[PDB]
Amino acid sequence: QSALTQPASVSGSPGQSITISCTGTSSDIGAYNYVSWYQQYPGKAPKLLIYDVSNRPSGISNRFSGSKSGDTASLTISGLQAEDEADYYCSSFANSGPLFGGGTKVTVLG
Amino acid sequence: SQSALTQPASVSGSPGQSITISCTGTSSDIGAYNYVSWYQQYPGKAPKLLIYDVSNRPSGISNRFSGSKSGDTASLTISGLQAEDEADYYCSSFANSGPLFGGGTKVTVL
Amino acid sequence: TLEKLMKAFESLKSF
Amino acid sequence: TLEKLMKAFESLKSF
Amino acid sequence: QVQLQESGGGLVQPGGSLRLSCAASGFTFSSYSMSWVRQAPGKGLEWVAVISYDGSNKYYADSVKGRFTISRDNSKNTLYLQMNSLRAEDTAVYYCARDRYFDLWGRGTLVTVSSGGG
Amino acid sequence: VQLQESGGGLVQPGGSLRLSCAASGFTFSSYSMSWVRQAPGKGLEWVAVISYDGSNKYYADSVKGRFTISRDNSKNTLYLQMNSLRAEDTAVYYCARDRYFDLWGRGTLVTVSSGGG
């Protein structure tokens, strides 16, 4: 069982928006504003999409946004397209070290 | 004395409107680096960081402030102009010989 | 402890 | 030089 | 040309040892803390260990503490992971990740721990 | 969380003065610190910077060889030794934290003159 909880899979039609939730607890996502999101293609290196809940690195599309409410963080992908089909992991911070979610497979229908 | 970076001496605006403060640098300042900042200073008060790295905004800063950069010139935009916006605004860049500042711009609200 | 965790993750940030 | 300038402005960033 | 490249992965027996290397290029290795993150086949990411920019402070996850040793040589731009007393559960792809944001990953290296067949 | 300068005053040309900056509400040891000054009715001018551990310093061409920046992390204080002061050094002196200058003090007044104008 993964430290942080994410949905196993989320599907969406091209152009739409999907939200990937990530539930932690009092002592990680709730305790800190240190949640990050990563995109991973099969057999490839993970890629940082968003750090510190809502902040986006320079070369990352603005279709990706991050937010946090209580013990849950969220990643939103708008203008969903084919290249967004991948695995998505959220990471938080904790007293014993960074935690990861189980990851979420995103499927675009075409 | 002439300031390293050039800003307009003063800009006035009616409440509710938007004003833009320009900041012209040189070959090796605003153009060479993406390290431009903007500061708000009230008389007799400590200067306050409004925007760093051209366009990035610190947590406690209103989203009425936005920053951009085109070539050797950076710009600060204040939207929804109100009374509390009347102050001095300075731009800073980065350079091979150290951080440079503009002469400052006095903003007047009518 | 938590003190040792923060010290382990330190980086040098400049211009 | 530019190297010494960047070295002077360094800060310690962690969690 | 900014990238991380792991190596030293391979197939080993339980109780055996293995040593991973991570070559950094295109940035100042000395300035960033570095981490090891691993991923079992078809499973999520798991953080393993971290070491400071100057190698003075290290920290390990409870699952590898006492068995794994992280280290770095800033003069040769390399991150290391000495793995001892390997178990089947340690079977994973091992990534090295830069800084506290994990803002840069390598392609990864395979570590498989089994006996005979699997 | 605040910075508070002190040590400013009125001095004669060629005289010396030392500015202090008391930091509170954060870990001083972790941030590089700078001195920025502002002449009457003029822009801000960066003077000097010192590393988080005081190992690397850097000065502007206008104060190099005359000003000395230093810090004592154990008392949370930034210092600025000013020697061979000139009229042009007359300014309000601020201390600013980190490379963003994301935290300033209210400033301290330094005037170098001999009653002329």
Numbering used by the authors:
A (entry chain B): 128 to 237
B (entry chain D): 127 to 236
C (entry chain E), D (entry chain F): 3 to 17
E (entry chain A): 1 to 118
F (entry chain C): 2 to 118
Describing publication, verbatim:
The sequence of the HTT-exon1 fragment can be divided into three regions: a 17-residue N-terminal region [HTT(1-17)], immediately followed by the polyQ tract of variable length and a proline-rich region at the C-terminal end of the peptide. The HTT(1-17) region is highly conserved, has a high propensity to adopt an amphipathic α-helical structure and has been shown to be involved in membrane binding, sub-cellular localization, aggregation and toxicity. A naïve human single-chain Fv antibody (scFv) phage-display library screened against HTT(1-17) was used to select the C4 scFv for use as an intrabody (a scFv antibody fragment that is engineered to be expressed within diseased cells). The C4 scFv intrabody can very effectively counteract the length-dependent polyglutamine expansion that induces pathologic HTT aggregation in cell culture, Drosophila, and mouse models of HD.
In this manuscript, we describe the effects of C4 scFv on the in vitro aggregation properties of mHTT protein fragments and report the crystal structure of the antibody fragment in complex with the 17-residue peptide at 2.5 Å resolution, as well as the characteristics of the binding of these two species in solution using NMR spectroscopy. We found that the asymmetric unit was in fact composed of two C4 scFv:HTT(1-17) complexes that were bound to each other through interactions between residues of the peptide ligand, resulting in a dimer of C4 scFv:HTT(1-17) complexes related to each other by a 2-fold non-crystallographic symmetry axis. Detailed analysis of a single C4 scFv:HTT(1-17) complex shows that the residues 3–11 of the bound HTT(1-17) peptide fold into a right-handed α-helix, while residues 12–17 of HTT(1-17) are in an extended conformation, of which residues 12–15 adopt a β-sheet structure. The C4 scFv binding to the peptide involves the side chain of Phe11 of HTT(1-17) being located in a hydrophobic pocket formed by the side chains of Trp47VH, Val50VH, Pro225VL, Arg100VH and Phe102VH and the Cβ atoms of residues Ser33VH and Ser35VH. The side chain of Leu7HTT makes contact with the aromatic ring of Tyr59VH and Phe220VL and interacts with the backbone atoms of several residues of the third antigen binding loop (CDR-L3) of the VL domain, namely, Asn222VL, Ser223VL and Gly224VL. The Oγ atom of Ser33VH is hydrogen bonded to the carbonyl oxygen of Phe11HTT, and the carbonyl oxygen of Glu12HTT is hydrogen bonded to the NH backbone amide of Tyr53VH. Indeed, the two peptide molecules associate to form an antiparallel β-sheet structure, involving an extensive network of hydrogen bonds between the main-chain atoms of residues 14–16 of each molecule, which is further stabilized through two C4 scFv-mediated hydrogen bonds between Ser31VH and Leu14HTT and between Tyr53VH and Glu12HTT, resulting in an extended β-sheet.
